Amino acid sequence: GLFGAIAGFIEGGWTGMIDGWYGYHHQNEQGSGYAADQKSTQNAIDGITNKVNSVIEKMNTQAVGKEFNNLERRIENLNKKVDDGFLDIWTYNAELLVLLENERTLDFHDSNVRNLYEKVKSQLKNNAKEIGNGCFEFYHKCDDACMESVRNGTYDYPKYSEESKLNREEI
Amino acid sequence: ADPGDTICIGYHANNSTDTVDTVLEKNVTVTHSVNLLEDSHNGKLCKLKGIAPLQLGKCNIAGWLLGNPECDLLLTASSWSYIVETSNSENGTCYPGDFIDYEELREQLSS
Amino acid sequence: HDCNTKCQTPHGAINSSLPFQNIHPVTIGECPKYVRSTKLRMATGLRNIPSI
């Protein structure tokens, strides 16, 4: 999409990530796991629900069929002209308001992902390289405590910086 | 290196076959969606506030109020939640002539 | 029939919370707004890509 992450530089989704819309897959010595980014999923959920509510909260109140005699053909045509006139407006509004917001929502999600990936890249700097498909290979040893530190955004950068310097120089 | 542990960033996928239209694209499969459009009915006329409609049947407003003899099922009518004319509603004025401002009367009666 | 509804149209009763219906323009009670569409579905989730 617009931010080239979803169906973009991250080629596919994770059917194995039940807990949220965006998150992390880790691999260390201890094993493999998934984890949702609770905070950004939450921001998204709130954003999207609010969007949905606005489109709907707007719409409100109005049809009460009328009759006319054989000498009232002009006011009858006007009544129909009115009824059809509003019906097309309201139909157009609705259909197009939905086409527009769908486009925007899929881009929103796309942005959220790109932004999540960038938040990590930002923390890790040169302590890990980018190996594509939204993956970060660590120059150092990252246990379960170190992974959690990435996901809650409180990763201690210099802590592992010295161990990571000496690994880029050689292997 | 040496272990080269990996973290990756990704998104939800599921076995949803719900599809939406965007402006740039049609039939996009999405993980979740909301239907905004009701298209089901129960094919019957029902009560409102627990009061049955008035079924004029073969009669029409005119035959009803005037008391066309085909409308005797209507003689005891007193309350209703709305009025139904069927597309068989032919019995109106039996002796022929103009019902003056009839359309206006219909309007008055619809409240 | 002896059913109850909060919204009635000449084709039948509607028993629903949605903002729109395409059943009939004429309604009695509390009804969704009539439109001519056959589809108004709003994305909430993301593009669903279950694999490579």
């Epitope: 807990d19 949220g20 819309w21 949702a36 609770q38 999923t41 939450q42 959920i45 629900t49 949905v52 509510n53 709907i56 909260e57 | 979740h32 909301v34 | 919370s17 949605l18 903002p19 909430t44 989730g45």
Partner: antibody, heavy 122, light 108 residues
């Protein structure tokens, strides 16, 4: 924003059954899970049950389980708590609360109903 | 059999006072703990979830902290509208569990 209007409180006899309602004023409700919580007179809050946004699942306390069934009617935008083997210790005011996350259950209750009193006694 | 305990059962305080309530869980529940406020005869309000995240409506007077087994809610400067009962609640596992409540009362 969301008002949850609760319905179906009442006086009932132990053994005999009762059904509770939680109807949301706002369309988006059908995207959230729903909790039921209760409060015995003068007492603390006790979690009772949850149902996800589809009805997919579906969770209960131990205090009650195999006596209460939670269900959901997303088209009518309402949620139901069916209570069968009622017992004097189930007397309480009952609250439904919307979940903070659902589509993703988070187990926290962010919008509450007014609460509905149920009295189990003979 | 998760058991949430709240301490103390009451506190009396002047408006302006810093009140601090604790809540202890019988086993480790990570940081998945929420605080609610309930005035009598009304529904509870959410204040804090995930140990320390403030919920959007809530004045920042409110502040949660803790991890694993021990948790505290702190009201920095009790306002008149803060006299009510406060319940903690674990969101680690089902069934969900409420502490037993801490009433905070005016001190005249």
């Amino acid at each position: 924003q969301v008002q949850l209007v609760q319905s179906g409180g009442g006086v009932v006899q132990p053994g005999r059954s009762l059904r509770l309602s939680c109807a949301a004023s706002e369309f988006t409700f059908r995207m959230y899970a729903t909790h039921w919580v209760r409060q015995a007179p003068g007492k603390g809050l006790e979690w009772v049950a949850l149902i996800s946004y589809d009805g997919s699942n579906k969770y209960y306390a131990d205090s009650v389980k195999g006596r209460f069934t939670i269900s959901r009617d997303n088209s009518m935008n309402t949620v139901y708590l069916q209570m069968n083997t009622l017992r004097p210790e189930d007397t309480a005011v009952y609250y439904c609360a919307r979940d903070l996350g659902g589509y993703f259950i988070r187990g926290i209750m962010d919008v509450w109903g007014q609460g509905t009193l149920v009295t189990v006694s003979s | 059999e998760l058991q949430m305990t709240q301490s103390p059962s009451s506190v009396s305080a002047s408006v302006g006072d810093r009140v601090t309530i604790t809540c202890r869980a019988s086993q480790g529940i990570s940081s998945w703990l929420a605080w609610y406020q309930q005035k009598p005869g009304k529904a509870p309000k959410l204040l804090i979830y995930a140990a320390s995240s403030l919920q959007s409506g809530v004045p920042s007077r409110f502040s949660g902290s803790g991890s694993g087994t021990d948790f505290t809610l702190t009201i920095s400067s009790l306002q008149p509208e803060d006299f009510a009962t406060y319940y903690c609640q674990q969101a680690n596992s089902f069934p969900l569990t409420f502490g037993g409540g801490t009433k905070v009362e005016i001190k005249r």
